[PDB]
Amino acid sequence: HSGLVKMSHPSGDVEACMVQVTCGSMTLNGLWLDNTVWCPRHVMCPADQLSDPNYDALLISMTNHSFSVQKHIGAPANLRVVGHAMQGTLLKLTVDVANPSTPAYTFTTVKPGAAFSVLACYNGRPTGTFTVVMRPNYTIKGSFLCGSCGSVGYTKEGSVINFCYMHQMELANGTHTGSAFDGTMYGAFMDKQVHQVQLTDKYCSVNVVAWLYAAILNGCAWFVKPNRTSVVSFNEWALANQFTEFVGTQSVDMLAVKTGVAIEQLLYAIQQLYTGFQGKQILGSTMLEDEFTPEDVNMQIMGVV
């Protein structure tokens, strides 16, 4: 065993922020921070109108009294809405009570290849947690059912929660996408119930490098050769072979120092392994793995945060 698992942040601080938002006949989840509740704006749309909503007119049609916000877990509460606004694909509802359990937090956009934790919620109740990597095509391979919209994704730096994702939709191929908290959708997606052009996914090269380092840290290094491929040369190759371009980080550099294996050795290895594992395995796998980040490998195997 590699010692790697899909590891999420503990979810308790975020659980204490989750609420149910109802607007007429629709209901979904919201995030209660300070005096604000964030939720997907399509809670305003009638179920027979999700294909072509005019969110501007829907917002005008609403009053503060049109929204009901309920906290179900912990100490239950019904929150009076005293203001409402739209930002991109999210609603910003102002409530009369500040969440007493508001954690230290920021809003940040997550980048392709980076990992974050998701708290899956239904009717304002947390039901599970998992971690995903933002794919190069700005989808995530998640697990979301009807009623999950408004479920949140986040990272944590120290005690500060960095909210990066609010769930909106499932694509035809079964992957998922949603909004950052500036209200933009990830990728080119729109929050309407129409089939949409979803872009080509790629192998995340930096994460494949991290995984090969995890294998070396486990004493599995049959694929390591003296041969090296430069970052520039690898990146020209990656463009032709459905890999993201490799951008080194201090986290990757720490793996290189610990193992004594240079990044360029693993970039050469990836080019060979992409043509076939030749009947061999790496960490029990016969294919490249890009769902573990350099930070994952440093933390889980080396204890370096």
Ligand X SMILES: *[C@H](O)[C@H](C[C@@H]1CCNC1=O)NC(=O)[C@H](CC(C)C)NC(=O)OC[C@@H]1CCC(=O)N1C[C@H]1C[C@@H]2C=C[C@H]1C2
Window of 95-103, 139-147, 241-249, 281-289 that interacts with ligand X by CB under 6 A: 139-147
Q: How far is CA 4 from CA 7, 119, 292, 296, in A?
A: 8, 21, 8, 8
Q: How far is the CB of 278 from its own copies (least distance, A)?
A: 27
d(CA 155, CA 151): 14
| Catalytic site includes residue 164 | no
Catalytic choice (23, 39, 42, 45):
42
Q: Which does 200 bind (CB under 5 to 8 A by kind): ligand X, its own copies, none?
A: its own copies
d(CA 177, CA 169): 6
Residue 145 burial (CB count, 10 A): 9
| Closest alpha carbon to 96 in 112, 117, 114, 78 | 78
Q: What is the DSSP string of 129-171?
A: EEEEE--TTS-B-----TT-TT-EEEEEETTEEEEEEEEEEE-
Window of 59-67, 171-179, 217-225, 282-290 that interacts with ligand X by CB under 6 A: 171-179
d(CA 10, CA 126): 13
Closer to its own copies by CB, 129 or 184: give it. 184
Residue 171 burial (CB count, 10 A): 16
Catalytic choice (17, 23, 121, 149):
149
Q: Which string of x and - marks every residue 35-74 that binds ligand X (by CB under 6 A)?
A: -------x-------x------------------------
| Catalytic site includes residue 176 | no
Q: How far is the CB of 37 from its own copies (least distance, A)?
A: 18
Residues acting as catalytic residues: 42, 149
By the criterion CB under 8 A, which residues form the site for its own copies? 87-88, 106-109, 111, 180, 182-184, 188, 196-197, 199-200, 231-232, 235, 239, 242, 245-248
